[PDB]
Nucleic acid binder design. Structure first.
Ligand SMILES: [Mg+2]
Ligand SMILES: [Mg+2]
Ligand SMILES: [Mg+2]
Ligand SMILES: [Mg+2]
Ligand SMILES: [Mg+2]
Ligand SMILES: [Mg+2]
Ligand SMILES: [Mg+2]
Ligand SMILES: [Mg+2]
Ligand SMILES: [Mg+2]
Ligand SMILES: [Mg+2]
Ligand SMILES: [Mg+2]
Ligand SMILES: [Mg+2]
Ligand SMILES: [Mg+2]
Lengths: 25, 97, 197, 127, 97, 214, 91
RNA sequence: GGUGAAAUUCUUGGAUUUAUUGAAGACUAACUACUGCGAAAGCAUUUGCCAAGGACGUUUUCAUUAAUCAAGAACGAAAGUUAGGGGAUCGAAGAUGAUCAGAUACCGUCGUAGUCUUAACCAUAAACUAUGCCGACUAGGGAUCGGGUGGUGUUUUUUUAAUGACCCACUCGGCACCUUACGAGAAAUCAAAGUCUUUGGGUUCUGGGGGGAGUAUGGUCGCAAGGCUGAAACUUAAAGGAAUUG
């Protein structure tokens, strides 16, 4: 598991995570 | 660990050079990192010289010869058996032959 | 009023009678009051001057260009517009030009043009921001604004009208041979959809 | 004496072009390629296809008037391989062997002041 | 190097600035040289040329507007024409350049 | 069958006489019948022949000369000078590592209304008894040589019509001028012009062509 | 004091029309209401009268310019290419 | 054309190939180097202009004005974002052609975004010498770049003077190299990575087993993508570095 794709998978996860939080306000 | 004190190239005091493209595979290469062979070929052959000699006006006109500076990438140079991978002691040698 | 570009009132002298002749030119960028404007075959290549298309070099930027020598201006008249000149055919004198739409027209070398670009360029780069600025723009042009959509109408008022949902219901690309009352939509359209490859 | 032509040999990979001209280049005489003499799509750059091409050029060259040529060996050039194909050099020897005369052998492969980025990608072509 | 010559006149020689004083200095023959700004109106430029033709006074054409001429003089206001009443230590009169 | 060879006339090539023999070869075109006759089509043609063909000696193996045909005097083609350029291997032979390369170009006008661009290539030379092994310049000598070259290459032109420009181009009298003027600045070994290219051809001047066609 | 952080002149529009449209309007309205250098009299006294009309409040000189600037970039380029054509014909 | 081989694509509506003429945009080959400049990123056709800079020289001037730096700032490859212009080539997305069990991968032909520019944003790279800066001292040699110095030294300039090019001997500053291991290091190796248990020249930043995790939260910056700052719960006995033998 390449480190640069850990970085990329985390950014998609973070994009989801603040999308749902902005929803949840 | 560090393999070469001159990491893989010839740059100490620049920080960048230019990109050049491999003749064999068109790969972008640092210009100081490319394996540069002065590809030397006679204009005709080692055999057809007399065959052109019998059919040429201007007897022994010039006998020209073609020049071109080729750039090889590291993978293509080794695959084409140009640099011929060396030992740990012998890779320090920088002599052309 | 009604035109984005400013107008230059240029006064000439009548060659055949003691009087002054006031012309109405579309002002070019950089032309000022008190500038001497020159119009003729031998006039100099300067911004605001009126020269025939054969008199100017290739690459010259011209405006208010005549389609035919003597129709007094037809091409590149709106604000910020111009005609490029891209070569001559001195035998049987024509002149190839580039129009503001990109069309490549061939015009006679005796057709005139004003050197430069029409003043007032960049006018459409500002958003009107609101309905009332479109109201005052078209108050001075004509009665074309506002525009009720055809799909918002009844079938009696439009081909697109009616339906239990607002929808065109048939291809909005209409043929060139279609009759008046049928051309509502995209007339003779070669293609549709967003310009993208 | 001798009616000089221009041989203008163009040797890429997958094909070789032996295109003889007039002495001014403009007028074409007997353009025969190696691909028209054989049907394998693999030897169309080979020496034998070009030899068959060069021999058939000399036949079409005769009864026309040209008896000598100017040799212009060329590869693809530009932003391409620039090394002449395997068929090009056989074509010269086959041309001389047919009996037609030679003069001013030259290489005319174009070389740029590098521009118009070479095809293949930054990582090159890897198979 | 012409601003350097003009600046040296200011600190050592005598001058007058503007138009009503340049013409009045041309009128009484107490002007050695007048310098006209580039963007000076041609009707005023031609009248200065005529006044300096009658008084037999050299005219220099500054390559700059009234703003740059006033700065070259060392002032903070636009100067259309400067009349050099007397040279200082400079060679501005000797070298028409 | 079609065989468009049978409809061809086999014209001839004649060089300018500011050279040795002009029997360049045989042009082969067409028959000048109606429906876009070949009398006018052959006007716009340039031919490529080596200089050593038009001078005999083998020292001029490089700098091939281009000739532009002008008129057809029945069975002929009358040509004027079009351009000079070296052969490819001559540039490759002179271009070597461990030496500076100096190049200079000016677009210059002759006494005629001729507009044509001229180059000049210079290669720095190792002097005798030298132990330094790259012979590079000081990057102000490069601009000094280039400035000297541009003055020399502008003074030799602006007299010197193409009738007499070719008579200075062949004997390397320009190279003598460059070496005799630049040798105080840096030693040089391969001084050449390497390229003559013609940009704007003026009115035809049929009389001027006839001088070079005896 | 700095009355607004970023809206500037576009504070007259309140909160409507969209931030991007007000921002695009801000760039062109700052040019439109600016004061430009008179090329004739040298003063900074040129103010727009109408779109394409730029007038100096001294020396009473009107020039035909762009809709929101005295001079547009494409027109300086046109003026630069017209003059370059002129010397070479005059040469 | 293209390929390991093909397919797709074009073609007696003339392809490819040959010649003349142009247009457009991009780039600056060969020369080009264990060479130069720049704080770094970076910077390679020509000339002109503008402002700057290092070194060298000095028997010029001031006389501690300095070193390093929280906070605070300027610049910062590529990609990417907004709005124009430009849009040749190449080419994330996508189409299609193959191989393959499958291939939405490699290979092949196209091809939008982008690649180019302007005005703004972003502020990240294996942004690396993975080596902070300033200062002193410790070992031998050659080569080179720039400045300087001295030769009863060569080279044509007119036969030789000057000056330029070159040679030799010194010097300073710079990019570097070769040998050796005094000394150092876990070693690889290192003239610094030496002058450290015989431990102390000045100073800034950073690390405290591996993961969780550059995550969560808060604050701040950004239009956005995201940047900067930055945990804990819990989990785990190794992870890891260098070298030896197979
Ligand atoms: Mg390894
Ligand atoms: Mg880097
Ligand atoms: Mg509506
Ligand atoms: Mg209704
Ligand atoms: Mg109906
Ligand atoms: Mg170059
Ligand atoms: Mg250098
Ligand atoms: Mg800080
Ligand atoms: Mg970082
Ligand atoms: Mg780091
Ligand atoms: Mg250095
Ligand atoms: Mg710990
Ligand atoms: Mg830890």
């Amino acid at each position: 598991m390449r480190a640069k794709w850990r970085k990329k998978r985390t950014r998609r996860l973070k994009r989801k995570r603040r999308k749902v939080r902005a929803r949840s306000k | 660990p560090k393999k070469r004190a001159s990491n893989g190239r010839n740059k100490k005091g620049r920080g960048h050079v230019k990109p050049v493209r491999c003749v064999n595979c068109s790969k972008s290469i640092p210009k100081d990192k490319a394996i540069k062979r002065m590809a030397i070929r006679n204009i005709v052959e080692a055999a057809a010289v007399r065959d052109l000699s019998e059919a040429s006006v201007y007897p022994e006109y010039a006998l020209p010869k073609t020049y071109n500076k080729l750039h090889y990438c590291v993978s293509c140079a080794i695959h084409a058996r140009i640099v011929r991978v060396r030992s740990r002691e012998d890779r320090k040698n920088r002599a052309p032959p | 009023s009604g035109r984005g570009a400013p107008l230059a009132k240029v006064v000439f002298r009548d060659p055949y009678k003691y009087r002054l002749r006031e012309e109405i030119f579309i002002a070019n960028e950089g032309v000022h009051t008190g500038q001497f404007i020159y119009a003729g075959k031998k006039a100099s290549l300067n911004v605001g001057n009126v020269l025939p298309l054969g008199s100017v070099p290739e690459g010259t930027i011209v405006s208010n260009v005549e389609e035919k020598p003597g129709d007094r201006g037809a091409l590149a008249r709106a604000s910020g517009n111009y005609v490029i000149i891209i070569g001559h055919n001195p035998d049987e004198n024509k002149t190839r030009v580039r129009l503001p739409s990109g069309a490549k027209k061939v015009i006679s070398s005796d057709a005139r043009g004003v050197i430069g670009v029409i003043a007032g360029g960049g006018r459409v780069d500002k958003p009107l921001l609101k309905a009332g600025r479109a109201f005052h723009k078209y108050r001075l042009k004509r009665n074309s604004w506002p525009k009720t959509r055809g799909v918002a109408m009844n079938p009696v008022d439009h081909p697109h009208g009616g339906g239990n949902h607002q929808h065109i219901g048939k291809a909005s690309t209409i043929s060139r041979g279609a009759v008046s009352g049928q051309k509502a939509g995209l007339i003779a359209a070669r293609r549709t959809g967003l310009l993208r490859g | 004496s001798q009616v000089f032509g221009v041989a203008r040999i163009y040797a890429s990979f997958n094909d070789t072009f032996v295109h003889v001209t007039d002495l001014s280049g403009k007028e074409t005489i007997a353009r025969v390629t190696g691909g028209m003499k054989v049907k394998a799509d693999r030897d169309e750059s080979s020496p034998y296809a070009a030899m068959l091409a060069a021999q058939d050029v000399a036949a079409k060259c005769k009864e026309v008037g040209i008896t000598a040529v100017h040799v212009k060996i060329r590869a693809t050039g530009g932003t391409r391989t620039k090394t002449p194909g395997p068929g090009g050099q056989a074509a010269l020897r086959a041309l001389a062997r047919s009996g037609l005369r030679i003069g001013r052998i030259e290489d005319v492969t174009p070389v740029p002041s590098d521009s118009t980025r070479k095809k293949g990608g930054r990582r090159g072509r890897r198979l | 190097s012409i601003n350097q010559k003009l600046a040296l006149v200011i600190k050592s020689g005598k001058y007058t600035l503007g138009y009503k004083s340049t013409v009045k200095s041309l009128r009484q023959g107490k002007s050695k040289l007048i310098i006209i700004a580039a963007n000076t109106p041609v009707l005023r430029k031609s009248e200065l040329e005529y006044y300096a033709m009658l008084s037999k006074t050299k005219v220099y054409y500054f390559q700059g507007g009234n703003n740059e001429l006033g700065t070259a003089v060392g002032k903070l206001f636009r100067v259309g024409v400067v009349s050099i009443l007397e040279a200082g230590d400079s060679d501005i009169l000797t070298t028409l350049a | 069958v079609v065989d468009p060879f049978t409809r061809k006339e086999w014209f001839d090539i004649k060089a300018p006489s500011t050279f040795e023999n002009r029997n360049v070869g045989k042009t082969l075109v067409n028959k000048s019948t109606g429906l876009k006759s070949a009398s006018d089509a052959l006007k716009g043609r340039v031919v490529e022949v080596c200089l050593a063909d038009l001078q005999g000696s083998e020292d001029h193996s490089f700098r091939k000369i281009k000739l532009r045909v002008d008129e057809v005097q029945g069975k002929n083609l009358l040509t004027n000078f079009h351009g000079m350029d070296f052969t490819t291997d001559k540039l490759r032979s002179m271009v070597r590592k461990w030496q500076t390369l100096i190049e200079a170009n000016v677009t210059v006008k002759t006494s005629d209304d001729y507009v044509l661009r001229i180059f000049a290539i210079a290669f720095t030379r190792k002097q005798a008894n030298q132990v330094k092994r790259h012979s590079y310049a000081q990057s102000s000598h490069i601009r000094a040589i280039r400035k000297v070259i541009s003055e020399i290459l502008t003074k030799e032109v602006q007299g010197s019509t193409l009738a007499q420009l070719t008579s200075k181009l062949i004997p390397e009298v320009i190279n003598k001028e460059i070496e005799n003027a630049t040798k105080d600045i840096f030693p040089l070994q391969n001084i050449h012009v390497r390229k003559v290219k013609l940009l704007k051809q003026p009115k035809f001047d049929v009389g001027a062509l006839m001088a070079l066609h005896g | 004091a700095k009355r607004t952080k970023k809206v500037g002149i576009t504070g007259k529009y309140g909160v409507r029309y969209g931030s991007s449209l007000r921002r695009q309007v801000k760039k062109l309205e700052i040019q439109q209401h600016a004061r430009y250098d008179c090329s004739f009299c040298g003063k900074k006294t040129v103010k727009r009268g109408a779109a394409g009309i730029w007038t100096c409040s001294c020396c009473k000189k009107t020039v035909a310019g762009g809709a929101y600037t005295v001079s547009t970039a494409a027109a300086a380029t046109v003026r630069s290419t017209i003059r370059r054509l002129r010397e070479m014909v005059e040469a």
